Amino acid sequence: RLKKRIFAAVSEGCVEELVELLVELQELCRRRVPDFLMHKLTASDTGKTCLMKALLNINPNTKEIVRILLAFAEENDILGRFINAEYTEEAYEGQTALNIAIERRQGDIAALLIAAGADVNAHAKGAFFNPKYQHEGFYFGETPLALAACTNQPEIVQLLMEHEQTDITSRDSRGNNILHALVTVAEDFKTQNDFVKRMYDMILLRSGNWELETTRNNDGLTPLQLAAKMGKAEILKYILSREIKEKRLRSLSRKFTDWAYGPVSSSLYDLTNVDTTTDNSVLEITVYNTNIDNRHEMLTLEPLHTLLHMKWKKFAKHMFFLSFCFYFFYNITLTLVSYYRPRLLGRMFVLIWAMCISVKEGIAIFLLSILSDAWFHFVFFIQAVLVILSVFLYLFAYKEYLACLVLAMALGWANMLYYTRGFQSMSMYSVMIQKVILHDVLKFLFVYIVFLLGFGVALASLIEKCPNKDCSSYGSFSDAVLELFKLTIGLGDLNIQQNSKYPILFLFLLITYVILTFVLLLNMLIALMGETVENVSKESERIWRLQRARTILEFEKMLPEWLRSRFRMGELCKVAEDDFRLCLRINEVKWTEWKTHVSFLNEDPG
Amino acid sequence: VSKESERIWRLQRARTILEFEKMLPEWLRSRFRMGELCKVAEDDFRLCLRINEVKWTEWKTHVSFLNEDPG
Amino acid sequence: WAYGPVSSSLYDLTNVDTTTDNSVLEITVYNTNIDNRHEMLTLEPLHTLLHMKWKKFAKHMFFLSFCFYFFYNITLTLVSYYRPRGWLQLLGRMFVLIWAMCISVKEGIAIFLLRPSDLQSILSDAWFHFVFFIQAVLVILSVFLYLFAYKEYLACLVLAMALGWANMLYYTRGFQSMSMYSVMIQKVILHDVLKFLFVYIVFLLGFGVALAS
Amino acid sequence: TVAEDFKTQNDFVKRMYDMILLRSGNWELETTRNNDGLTPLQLAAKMGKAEILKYILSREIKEKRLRSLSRKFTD
Ligand SMILES: COc1ncnc(OC)c1C(=O)Nc1nc(C(F)(F)F)c(-c2ccnc(C(C)(C)C#N)c2)s1
Ligand SMILES: COc1ncnc(OC)c1C(=O)Nc1nc(C(F)(F)F)c(-c2ccnc(C(C)(C)C#N)c2)s1
Ligand SMILES: COc1ncnc(OC)c1C(=O)Nc1nc(C(F)(F)F)c(-c2ccnc(C(C)(C)C#N)c2)s1
Numbered sequence: 001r002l003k004k005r006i007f008a009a010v011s012e013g014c015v016e017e018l019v020e021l022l023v024e025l026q027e028l029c030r031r032r033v034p035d036f037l038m039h040k041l042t043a044s045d046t047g048k049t050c051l052m053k054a055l056l057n058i059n060p061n062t063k064e065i066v067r068i069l070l071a072f073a074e075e076n077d078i079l080g081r082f083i084n085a086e087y088t089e090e091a092y093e094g095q096t097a098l099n100i101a102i103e104r105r106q107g108d109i110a111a112l113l114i115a116a117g118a119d120v121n122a123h124a125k126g127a128f129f130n131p132k133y134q135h136e137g138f139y140f141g142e143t144p145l146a147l148a149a150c151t152n153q154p155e156i157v158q159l160l161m162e163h164e165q166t167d168i169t170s171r172d173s174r175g176n177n178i179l180h181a182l183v184t185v186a187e188d189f190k191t192q193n194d195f196v197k198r199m200y201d202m203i204l205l206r207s208g209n210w211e212l213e214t215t216r217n218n219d220g221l222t223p224l225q226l227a228a229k230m231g232k233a234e235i236l237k238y239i240l241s242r243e244i245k246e247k248r249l250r251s252l253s254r255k256f257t258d259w260a261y262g263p264v265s266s267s268l269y270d271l272t273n274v275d276t277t278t279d280n281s282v283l284e285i286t287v288y289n290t291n292i293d294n295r296h297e298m299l300t301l302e303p304l305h306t307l308l309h310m311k312w313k314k315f316a317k318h319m320f321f322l323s324f325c326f327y328f329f330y331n332i333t334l335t336l337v338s339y340y341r342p343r344l345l346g347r348m349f350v351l352i353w354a355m356c357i358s359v360k361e362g363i364a365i366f367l368l369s370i371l372s373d374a375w376f377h378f379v380f381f382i383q384a385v386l387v388i389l390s391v392f393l394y395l396f397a398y399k400e401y402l403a404c405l406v407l408a409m410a411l412g413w414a415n416m417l418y419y420t421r422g423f424q425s426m427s428m429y430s431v432m433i434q435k436v437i438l439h440d441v442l443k444f445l446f447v448y449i450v451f452l453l454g455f456g457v458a459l460a461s462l463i464e465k466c467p468n469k470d471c472s473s474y475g476s477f478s479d480a481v482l483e484l485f486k487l488t489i490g491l492g493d494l495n496i497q498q499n500s501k502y503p504i505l506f507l508f509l510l511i512t513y514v515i516l517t518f519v520l521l522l523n524m525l526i527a528l529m530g531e532t533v534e535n536v537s538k539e540s541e542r543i544w545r546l547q548r549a550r551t552i553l554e555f556e557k558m559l560p561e562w563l564r565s566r567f568r569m570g571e572l573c574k575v576a577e578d579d580f581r582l583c584l585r586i587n588e589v590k591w592t593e594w595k596t597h598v599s600f601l602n603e604d605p606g
Numbered sequence: 607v608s609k610e611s612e613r614i615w616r617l618q619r620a621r622t623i624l625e626f627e628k629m630l631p632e633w634l635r636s637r638f639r640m641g642e643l644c645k646v647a648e649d650d651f652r653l654c655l656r657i658n659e660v661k662w663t664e665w666k667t668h669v670s671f672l673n674e675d676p677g
Numbered sequence: 678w679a680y681g682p683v684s685s686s687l688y689d690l691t692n693v694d695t696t697t698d699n700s701v702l703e704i705t706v707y708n709t710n711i712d713n714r715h716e717m718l719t720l721e722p723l724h725t726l727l728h729m730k731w732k733k734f735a736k737h738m739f740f741l742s743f744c745f746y747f748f749y750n751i752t753l754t755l756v757s758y759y760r761p762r763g764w765l766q767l768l769g770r771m772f773v774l775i776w777a778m779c780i781s782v783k784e785g786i787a788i789f790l791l792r793p794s795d796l797q798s799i800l801s802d803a804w805f806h807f808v809f810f811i812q813a814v815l816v817i818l819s820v821f822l823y824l825f826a827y828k829e830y831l832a833c834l835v836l837a838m839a840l841g842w843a844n845m846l847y848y849t850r851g852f853q854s855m856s857m858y859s860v861m862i863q864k865v866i867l868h869d870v871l872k873f874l875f876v877y878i879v880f881l882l883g884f885g886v887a888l889a890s
Numbered sequence: 891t892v893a894e895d896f897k898t899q900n901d902f903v904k905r906m907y908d909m910i911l912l913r914s915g916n917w918e919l920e921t922t923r924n925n926d927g928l929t930p931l932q933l934a935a936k937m938g939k940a941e942i943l944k945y946i947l948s949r950e951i952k953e954k955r956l957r958s959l960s961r962k963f964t965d
Pocket of ligand 1: 407409410411413414416417
């Protein structure tokens with residue numbers, strides 16, 4: 001047939017004479033109308049046309065070939081639905097020839113196709129271009145502008161934005177516009193040369209306006225909140241501290257120096273969607289999202305760090321010390337009620353406070369990874385439940401209340417860790433609350449149960465029924481399991497006299513058990529110690545900073561509306577003709593970048 | 607031993623896979639027999655295995671094909 | 678195929694995919710005179726061939742191997758605990774006996790064609806053929822000594838149960854997480870615990886003679 | 891008073907100190923006491939400007955005329 005011949009002549013490109021003669025033959029067959037021409041000019045299995053197959057296979061003679069193809073399509077008044085054709089397969093649906101021309105870094109042919117009238121809003125709405133998860137498919141933004149900006153082709157991005165029909169505010173299937181897409185594709189500093197920062201700045205300045213940055217995708221996130229959700233520390237550092245000095249695009253900045261005199265410089269940072277006064281700010285998302293493992297570097301950014309420090313030093317230090325004091329006196333009263341138990345009028349101060357915790361942490365659990373952040377919610381709730389249960393059992397005629405009361409006292413003294421985590425002495429607890437939490441200890445427990453059960457059977461089997469202390473504490477299976485457990489708990493004793501027909505085999509298996517349990521214990525030991533003390537101190541400091549931020553936000557959530565408005569970090573500042581956006585002032589001193597100061601809001605510093 | 611674990615796991619895994627594949631009956635092996643025929647040249651027709659690799663650290667351009675239409 | 682960071686390539690499997698006399702896969706896997714297999718079993722065609730063989734049949738064959746050994750070990754434990762000190766007990770004992778004979782012939786065949794330089798490293802899979810064979814031999818020997826009028830069948834039975842539960846480490850080295858855990862455990866034991874135990878037995882015997890005299 | 895460190899200033903205050911001290915070649919600048927009685931050297935001692943103090947305490951002018959401004963004389 002002629003379809004395969006045209007496709008081969010257009011993919012191989014060894015000479016355009018083959019495709020010229022084949023197109024002459026095709027026109028001859030057509031003279032004997034548009035649907036037939038393109039049904040024979042496309043591949044019915046995918047919807048691909050000769051133009052896509054020509055651009056998918058770039059060869060030293062492909063520009064002339066696409067020129068020939070477009071000339072033949074325009075000479076038949078079909079170029080409209082031929083240059084705008086798109087795939088039909090489920091995986092690559094929506095992909096057109098301009099996507100392929102840009103993905104092949106062919107700028108000249110791309111300009112050719114845009115001049116010929118290829119619509120520049122073609123959304124590659126396929127399951128390959130909108131992957132369920134990354135690393136299975138290629139998500140760039142489902143648009144020729146997003147594809148030109150994601151593949152680092154600023155020439156084509158200029159060619160696309162200078163066009164007339166381009167939609168810079170176009171939103172793809174995922175709800176993302178160009179800026180969300182740039183945020184998702186951006187990875188790092190020197191991994192791919194950090195061109196996405198350049199493209200972000202260029203696309204935001206070219207369309208100088210706040211609509212691209214205030215647009216929410218289908219998850220209700222803006223490009224800034226989307227950089228906060230993921231761990232895009234570089235794009236977040238750029239957007240947050242973004243200083244444009246062009247006189248017309250100054251209102252696009254998020255940081256405004258107003259003060260510089262010499263090395264001293266007082267800058268303002270913008271706190272609109274950043275300072276926890278809205279639905280979910282960069283602060284909220286950066287602090288509470290436990291899916292990046294990069295909060296160590298994102299909570300030290302320019303406005304966020306000082307915002308956390310200010311909230312702390314303003315009210316969270318006081319609220320935290322007050323709650324620590326209240327829990328400390330709660331625990332002291334609990335200890336004195338547990339010591340002077342009736343084997344004395346304040347025995348109720350505990351109860352009330354218990355119920356308070358019982359509801360507070362209770363509600364705190366009802367509103368929701370969740371064993372590293374919310375652990376203390378569960379332990380405080382369990383402690384309060386134990387206390388109220390001890391009281392209920394004490395006023396009833398139960399003598400089992402002492403167990404719960406002593407357990408509650410002990411668990412409260414253990415919960416005292418939540419308040420002392422950055423104290424360099426409760427460091428190992430505050431760090432093994434995370435590594436030992438889930439997987440490090442359950443493997444040990446499984447292997448230890450296997451050891452215990454197997455060796456219990458092996459040792460109980462070796463023992464002979466005897467006339468009723470039996471001369472053997474390894475009698476039934478339960479007695480051997482108990483002896484072995486007591487052994488790994490240093491509560492036991494090795495006797496070479498256990499009333500066995502094979503005492504040497506019994507001794508061998510007992511010592512084998514001892515040594516194997518010691519190996520398991522040593523594994524868990526070197527696991528939870530894992531010293532590298534520089535790095536473990538990094539880990540403890542990082543955990544303290546993260547929990548400090550988390551509790552700062554928890555404490556800010558507790559205050560009423562009026563107290564929150566009275567704390568309310570951020571001075572109102574005019575930054576443009578009429579902008580008046582709440583900012584946060586940061587004074588700095590730099591003795592290295594000596595420059596004449598031409599960007600400032602106030603000419604008289606102070 | 608952090609990595610030595612992966613080394614020993616990979617070696618034991620490969621040896622287990624190969625001995626299991628040897629244990630099967632010849633018709634079962636013929637049934638599984640990963641790899642599909644593919645015409646490479648005028649008459650080449652070799653058993654090729656298609657591997658799709660996504661490397662997200664890519665900075666280059668590709669222009670070649672055997673069936674340009676993505677599968 | 679390549680479009681962006683994606684690339685669908687077509688590798689050749691002519692003398693590679695284990696359908697010839699000795700392919701690159703079988704040679705790369707079975708040759709233990711190099712100590713470079715860790716780097717060669719990661720090349721794209723061999724890597725994906727092993728992955729697909731796994732997914733297709735070897736995952737299931739391995740899980741069935743593990744399940745059969747697990748239930749054989751459980752029945753061995755049950756006949757060791759409930760020993761005589763014949764309705765269904767002897768059914769289970771005949772299960773463990775025929776399965777011990779099967780395991781013994783299998784691992785003995787594997788040992789016969791087990792070339793040296795496989796046993797070069799202690800943390801190597803080749804070593805397991807020996808412990809599986811020893812345990813199956815202990816089981817059949819205990820059944821032989823129990824059919825006769827011997828008392829020492831219990832030592833062999835308990836040793837066989839203990840060695841089977843130890844041999845489950847071969848299967849825990851086949852799963853992925855349990856691979857790292859079990860290899861760490863077995864490294865600790867076979868390398869450091871044995872050296873320390875040699876020098877510590879020296880200490881024990883010396884100071885025991887010293888304090889006893 | 892203005893000198894900070896090397897990681898923050900790259901040591902230009904030492905160079906400006908040398909320049910302004912040589913161009914006005916006389917002990918009137920180094921023997922002057924502020925409203926605390928501190929000379930520039932005692933002031934560099936009081937606030938721990940270790941780089942400025944190291945410069946002043948061992949300052950050797952090899953020029954023949956400005957050698958009386960030296961504090962260390964390699965002979
Ligand atoms: C700063 O710590 C303290 N300071 C002064 N006094 C204290 O107790 C009187 C304490 C203290 O930690 N007490 C505790 N109580 C309990 C409870 F089980 F009862 F909940 C503790 C507990 C809970 C869960 N797993 C364990 C382990 C794994 C270690 C075991 N086994 C221990 S720990
Ligand atoms: C998952 O492990 C288990 N789960 C449940 N039950 C079990 O045993 C009842 C087991 C188990 O490990 N059993 C074992 N059997 C034996 C054998 F000596 F017989 F070979 C073991 C052995 C072999 C060589 N060197 C030692 C050391 C160095 C430690 C000494 N001394 C111990 S260990
Ligand atoms: C034959 O003994 C074993 N075989 C195999 N494995 C074993 O442990 C894994 C063991 C064993 O002795 N275990 C132990 N457990 C505990 C406990 F912490 F629970 F109390 C032990 C204990 C008891 C009392 N005073 C301490 C001091 C203060 C010295 C400390 N530290 C530790 S000792």
